[PDB]
């Protein structure tokens, strides 16, 4: 019942349209957010105060 | 239909493990040792949000 | 040989862990899948106005 053709085809085409060549973009997002959140978390005591 | 799906989604000379073998290998190696970290990140994000 | 291969595959699934993983994933979006997509579109508009 979960192997219905319409849902599988729509999911597959959408995943293709979304992740086509976006490895570099996602790597950049991960690195930038890692650096920003580490910088913000180094001020845990400051934010608490 | 069985023959068609086994031929199209099966191993090929260019892709020795096939699409499913490649995706499970990439997910097993790309997420090795990140179970606890992902759990903690998801819990913290859920709490904050 | 086919039965031996299927058995070798099936001995690795360990249905307890698969069951809890699938239950968590299903509860994650049990009734909000159109809401999340509308959220992504809304965030797209937000970033298009903020950047």
């Amino acid at each position: 019942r979960s192997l219905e053709p319409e849902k599988v085809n729509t999911i597959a085409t959408s995943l293709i349209t979304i992740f086509q060549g976006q490895g570099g973009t996602i790597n950049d997002i991960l690195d930038q957010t890692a650096q920003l959140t580490a910088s913000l978390a180094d001020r845990d005591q400051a934010i608490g105060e | 239909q069985v023959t068609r799906l086994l031929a199209d989604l099966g191993p090929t000379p260019e892709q020795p493990k096939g699409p499913f073998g490649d995706i499970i290998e990439s997910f097993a190696d790309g997420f090795a040792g990140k179970g606890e970290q992902l759990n903690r990140t998801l819990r913290g994000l859920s709490d904050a949000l | 040989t086919l039965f031996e291969t299927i058995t070798a595959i099936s001995e690795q699934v360990d249905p307890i862990k698969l069951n809890e993983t699938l239950t968590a994933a299903a509860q994650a979006l049990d009734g909000l899948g159109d809401k999340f997509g509308r959220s992504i579109v809304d965030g797209n508009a937000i970033l298009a106005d903020v950047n």
């Binding site: - | 023959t3 068609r4 086994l6 493990k17 096939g18 073998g21 499970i24 190696d29 | 086919l2 690795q12």
Partner: protein, 52 residues
């Protein structure tokens, strides 16, 4: 279990009709069981079970 036969399929279902002694050139044959079993075994044996 068996009981082969031959089916004459015409999507149009009309038009010119075959004459006695003629020959039908377009034909098809089902996928054999041996190739399907081989394909299944190959496609299952390549999956890395330890990675699963």
């Amino acid at each position: 279990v068996g009981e082969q036969f031959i089916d004459l399929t015409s999507d149009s279902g009309g038009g010119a009709y075959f004459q006695p002694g003629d020959t039908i050139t377009k034909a098809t044959v089902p996928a054999e069981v041996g190739p399907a079993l081989d394909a299944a075994e190959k496609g299952l044996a390549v999956l890395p079970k330890e990675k699963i």
